[PDB]
Structures are given as C-alpha cells and as structure tokens.
Amino acid sequence: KVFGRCELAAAMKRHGLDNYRGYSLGNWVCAAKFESNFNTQATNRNTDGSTDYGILQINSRWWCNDGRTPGSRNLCNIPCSALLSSDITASVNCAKKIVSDGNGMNAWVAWRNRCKGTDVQAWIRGCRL
C-alpha cells in the first residue's frame, strides 16, 4: 500500500508514534517518506546482505527474520514479510523497539540525514489526523 502523507500520519498517531520517545509525528512521517516513499511494500538490499523492509525500512540484520541474512537477529520476533503489510502495526511496534535502543531515530540513516533538525511539522501540516 502507498499511503498518502496525512493518511500515514493519522495511522502512525493511532498506533502511538506521536511523541514516542519524544519524537513528534512529523519525524516519523518524514522518516517514512525518505525510507519508503510511504510504500509498505518497499524492500532494499543492503551491501552486508541484509534487507530493509516496509514503510520504515526495518533491517533484517537485527529486527526481523527473512531467512537469508547470516548471523542476524530477529529482535522484533516477526517474519520481515510482516513489515510489508498494508496494516502498519508490525512496522510501528518494531520501530518502537528500534527507537528505544539507544540512538533514537538516528537508527534511520535517512532520518538523520534528511529529517533531523528540519521543520518536520511540515509533514503533518494541514492533515486531518
């Protein structure tokens, strides 16, 4: 599913991401925009052999099981395929564990490089949430 900007903001807020670990909703929408262009089916192979999955490009190196990433963990206890669902619950629940892991949203390199420090409220501006 390719979410609209406001549609994803509303869903992320309903799922508890708004101010989760202090990160305002715009941070999460911005990260999703640059990680997946709001496409739940986005997948990208990393140079290390891991794969990023879903709207928040969660990596099989640590967070999910895809059966093809040697030496990896599955800290969210889920099939990476669950991160591609039109329903963002699995991606949100796993993102909550990732963002609580110590480096906050810096875990998302696109967030650090393209959202961090910017006017992220612009991502939820005008939205009926």
Site residues for Na ion per CB under 5 A = 60, 65, 69, 72, 74
Number of chain positions touching V ion (CB under 5 A): 6
Half-sphere exposure of 127 (CA within 13 A, CB side): 19
**Active site (annotated) includes residue 52:** yes
**Active site (annotated) includes residue 7:** no
Taking the least distance from each CB to Cl ion, the nearer of 66 and 90 is 66
For position 87 contacting V ion by CB under 5 A, the verdict is yes
Crossing angle between the packed helical segments 5-14 and 25-36, to the nearest 10 degrees: 130
Q: How far is the CB of 50 from ligand [O] (least distance, A)?
A: 7
Residue nearest Na ion (C-beta atom): 72
Neighbours of 16 (CB within 10 A): 11
- Report residue 20 as tokens: 């989760």
Catalytic residue among 7, 18, 35, 119: 35
Longest dimension (CA), the chain: 44
Written in H, E and C, the secondary structure of 42-89 is CEEECCCCCEEECCCCEECCCCCECCCCCCCCCCCCCEHHHHHCCCCH
For position 14 contacting ligand [O] by CB under 6 A, the verdict is yes
Q: How far is the CB of 79 from Na ion (least distance, A)?
A: 10
- Indicate which residues carry an active-site annotation: 35, 52
Positions touching ligand [O] (CB under 6 A) are 10, 13-14, 46, 52, 59, 87, 89, 129
